[PDB]
């Protein structure tokens, strides 16, 4: 597997308004899952003088299980884009393994707005890419995602009706996690 290759952060975008509240994924769209659970995820990013640091979790809809993680990387030049590094932390954010130099995600944002966002994600282990995912997200479970960021999907090749809609996945998200 490869990432997708036509991928660039929207140029104009607003920065406060994607490092804004907290976001869960309402819809995702992945390449060449290597497993077939499905997840259901929320993250929190935050950006100062060019760092990006976000509390990232996960929860497997077909085992119930969660898994957490705190990213840290730079902007680019380009816009709202950054490769991040990233630790694995437990539920109280005590740190199991520390970031390492192997393993990362480069994130895009394609759009953002008031309520809602586009991105991509590319996650990578050494030589290897391992997943390329597109999430929509909006700042509370289950909100509808706007018109504006489903006409990205649409501007960005994609079809929204072919993404996984995590809303029938039976979600639990762990707010206390993800707050600060
Ligand atoms: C609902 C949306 C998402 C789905 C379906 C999904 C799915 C997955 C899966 C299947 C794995 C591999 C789990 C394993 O077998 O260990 C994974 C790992 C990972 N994902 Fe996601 N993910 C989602 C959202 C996100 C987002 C938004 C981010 C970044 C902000 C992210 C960053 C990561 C990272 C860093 C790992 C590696 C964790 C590790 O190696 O322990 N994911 N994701």
């Given at each position: 597997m490869?990432?997708?290759?036509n991928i660039?952060?929207k140029?104009?975008?607003?920065k ?8 869960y ?10 497993v077939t659970?499905?997840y259901?995820?929320?993250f929190?990013?935050?950006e100062?003088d060019?760092?990006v640091?976000?509390?990232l979790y996960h929860?497997?809809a077909?085992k119930?299980t969660?898994?957490?993680?705190i ?14 590094k990233?630790?694995?932390?437990d ?11 192997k393993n ?6 394609l759009?953002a707005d008031?309520?809602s966002?586009?991105?991509h994600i ?7 890419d391992?997943?390329?995912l597109?999430?929509?997200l ?6 509808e995602?706007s ?7 649409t ?19 762990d707010?206390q996690?993800?707050?600060?």
């Open positions: 490869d990432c997708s290759t660039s952060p140029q104009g975008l607003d406060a308004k994607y490092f804004s509240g907290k976001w994924v309402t819809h995702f769209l992945d390449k060449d899952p290597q659970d499905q259901c995820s929320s929190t990013p935050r100062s060019g760092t640091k976000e509390a929860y497997n077909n119930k969660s898994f957490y993680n990213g840290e990387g730079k902007l680019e030049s380009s816009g709202l884009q950054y490769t991040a990233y630790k694995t932390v539920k109280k954010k005590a740190v199991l393994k520390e970031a390492d130099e990362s995600y480069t994130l895009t944002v759009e008031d309520s966002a586009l991105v590319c996650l990578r282990e050494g030589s290897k391992l997943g390329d597109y999430t929509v909006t700042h509370q479970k289950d909100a995602p018109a504006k960021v489903k006409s990205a999907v501007q960005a090749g994609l079809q929204l009706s072919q993404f996984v809609g995590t809303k029938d996945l039976g979600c639990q998200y707010d996690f993800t707050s600060l």
